[PDB]
């Protein structure tokens, strides 16, 4: 499930 502390802007590489 989505981690609320995670940053969506991260490079997913």
């Amino acid at each position, epitope marked *: 499930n*989505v981690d609320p502390n995670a940053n969506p*802007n991260v*490079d997913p590489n």
Partner: antibody
Amino acid sequence: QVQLVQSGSELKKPGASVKVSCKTSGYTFTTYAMNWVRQAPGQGLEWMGWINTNTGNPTYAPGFTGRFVFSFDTSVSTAYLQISSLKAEDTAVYYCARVYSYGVPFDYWGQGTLVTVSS
Amino acid sequence: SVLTQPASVSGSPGQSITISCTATSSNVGSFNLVSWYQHHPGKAPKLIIHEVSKRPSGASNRFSGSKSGNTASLTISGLQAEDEADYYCCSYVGSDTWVFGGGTKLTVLG
């Protein structure tokens, strides 16, 4: 202090193009995503999409796929919204807004840019 | 909208009022990434609640939020004239997308 400062009001004819700027300060521009939100007259806020400031990958909500472009210029920590082939129903106040995390979206907002499209 | 809010609510100074936000789609999943924004006209919206109930420091402690089932609620206590504004709920809806509720006009009957 985190600031998002947008360019001034625009008055356009249908078919014209417009480019709204969203200049940031007080944080590292490429650390956080820049989102865009619209409010048409007599309507509510509508999420338009966002651009990833590390990868450049844009995401557009349905309704904003076709004539809209999210971009940025890291040299001046600025995000842009460009609209091609403007329609009367593009008339709205456009906002930029940062997302900090999935839990905390839209923590800082630009002040809004009014774009009026009229014949 | 994917999130249904009452068009308007009204209250007198001192009272408490509650604004509902109901998901009309399972795209919200567990519906735990719900945020609320206060919007005075001609100004930028302001974050007042996130993750259903978390009020950040710098938002008034008269703002609170809860949920039951698929309905999230914002409650404003000790209603004051400056609370008059539009209020929007907001949810994550998967695949790095968000959606706002239709908005609620709050009138403080002063």
